[PDB]
Amino acid sequence: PPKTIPIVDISAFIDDNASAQAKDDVVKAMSHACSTYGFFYLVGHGIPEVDRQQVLDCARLFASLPMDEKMGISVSKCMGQSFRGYEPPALQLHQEGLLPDTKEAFIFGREVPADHPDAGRFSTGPNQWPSSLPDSEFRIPLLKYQEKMVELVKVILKILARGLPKEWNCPPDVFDAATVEPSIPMRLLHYAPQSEEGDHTDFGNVSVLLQEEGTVGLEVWYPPTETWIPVPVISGSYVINMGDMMQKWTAGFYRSARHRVVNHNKKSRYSAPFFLNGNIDLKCKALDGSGVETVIGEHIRQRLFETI
């Protein structure tokens, strides 16, 4: 029974002067992690720690807005199925903060203008922005960080493509089309402390989680030993996991693991997960050459219906 998910240092891939052996070491480590656990810690991404800390400060800043202003940009008010804006807690009584055991989030994605023909299509459309926060303090750092998440998931996909079974003869670009005009939702999550008194998989391709220091929140189901693996916070790391669409694309070689967040917090906790769903119109062919075709957006919408 494993005690931890593995860790992958991708430095050899962020620098063009690393040895072929070191790059190959990264490829094998990430391939084994994603085909065994579906999860791994990633370090060596090169995203400055000040930027990560700024993202968590944005989460805290948004959460500090009064309930009325956050509901002014409720996801109810977004365009079509773009699912952008404020996700309210399940219960609320006051304008300030959260009731214990609830959570709230700000969701934003790829900026698509309202008059674009795709606006309002699944996970596609304009973002909603809280007007009381100045651009320099919220929207601008979040969009800059979004640039960096897009570049990081591109690198992750190149490493993963190099890690597939060689007899499938997949080229290292095999995933690249998913990164063109993609669905890329990001959440700024605020978890209230636990009171004194869930199980899921991600549907997309790659998830990149920024954790705040604190007690263990995340657990990953490992079927072979039927155990929940805790994922404590590791300084400098992201938690990376594969989603259902990636598992489907790779005919099950890369696993999409069940996971849940446990709330042992005595104070409010924040996190910032970024999700690569991918281009919602891309038709993906099973990389084992079995001829199965899956359209990303149809797959994700189907997963939503099956889970709700």
289: left (phi over 0), alpha (psi -120 to 50) or beta: left
DSSP code, position 8: E
265: left (phi over 0), alpha (psi -120 to 50) or beta: beta
Write the interaction track for a copy of itself spanning residues 109-138; mark x where CB under 8 A is met and - where it is not. ------------------------------
Q: How far is the CB of 11 from Cl ion (least distance, A)?
A: 8
Q: How far is the CB of 243 from Fe ion (least distance, A)?
A: 8
Phi, psi of 60 (to 5 degrees): -65, -40
Q: Which of residues 1-30 bind a copy of itself (CB under 8 A)?
A: 3-4, 6-7, 9, 11-12, 15, 18-19, 21-22, 25, 29
* Contact of residue 81 among a copy of itself, Fe ion, Cl ion, none (CB under 5-8 Å per partner type): none
Among 34, 37, 40, 44, binds a copy of itself (CB under 8 A): 44
Token code pair at residue 178: 């998913």
Q: Is 236 in the site for a copy of itself (CB under 8 A)?
A: yes
Based on CB atoms, which residue is closest to Fe ion, 202 or 244? 202
* Contact of residue 6 among Cl ion, Fe ion, a copy of itself, none (CB under 5-8 Å per partner type): a copy of itself
Write the interaction track for Cl ion spanning residues 19-38; mark x where CB under 5 A is met and - where it is not. ----------x---------
Based on CB atoms, which residue is closest to a copy of itself, 71 or 262? 262
Give the CA angle between residues 12, 14, 246 to the nearest 5°: 95
Q: Please give the biggest Cα pair distance in the chain.
A: 59
Site size toward a copy of itself, by CB under 8 A: 28
Q: Is 212 in the site for Fe ion (CB under 5 A)?
A: no
Q: Which of residues 149-208 bind Fe ion (CB under 5 A)?
A: 202
Among 131, 225, 235, 290, binds a copy of itself (CB under 8 A): 235
Token code pair at residue 64: 């500090």
Residues found in the chain: 308
214: left (phi over 0), alpha (psi -120 to 50) or beta: left
DSSP string, 215-278: S--EEEEEGGGTEEEEE---TT-EEEEE-HHHHHHTTTSS----EEE----SS-EEEEEEEE-B
Give the interface with a copy of itself as residue ranges (CB under 8 A).
Answer: 3-4, 6-7, 9, 11-12, 15, 18-19, 21-22, 25, 29, 43-44, 213-216, 232-236, 264, 266-267
Give the interface with Cl ion as residue ranges (CB under 5 A).
Answer: 8-9, 29
